[PDB]
């Protein structure tokens, strides 16, 4: 039941988008450089 990826801390989008891509029922993830939230 991966729904936090807490162990993903200090990791990288690689393993993130990778595994995160499913775990739950295909729960994906938005890869962004922090920045603001679209104006």
């Amino acid at each position: 039941m991966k729904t936090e990826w807490p162990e993903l801390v200090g990791k990288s989008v690689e393993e993130a988008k990778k595994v995160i891509l499913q775990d739950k029922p295909e729960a994906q993830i938005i890869v962004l450089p922090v920045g603001t939230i679209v104006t």
Partner: peptide, 24 residues
């Protein structure tokens, strides 16, 4: 909400997941 398939995965300078995603 529901099982949205997206999570604000913010990255650092060298892509260092400094923020943990959850989707829950």
């Amino acid at each position: 909400e529901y099982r949205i398939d997206r999570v604000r995965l913010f990255v650092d300078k060298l892509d260092n997941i400094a923020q943990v995603p959850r989707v829950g």
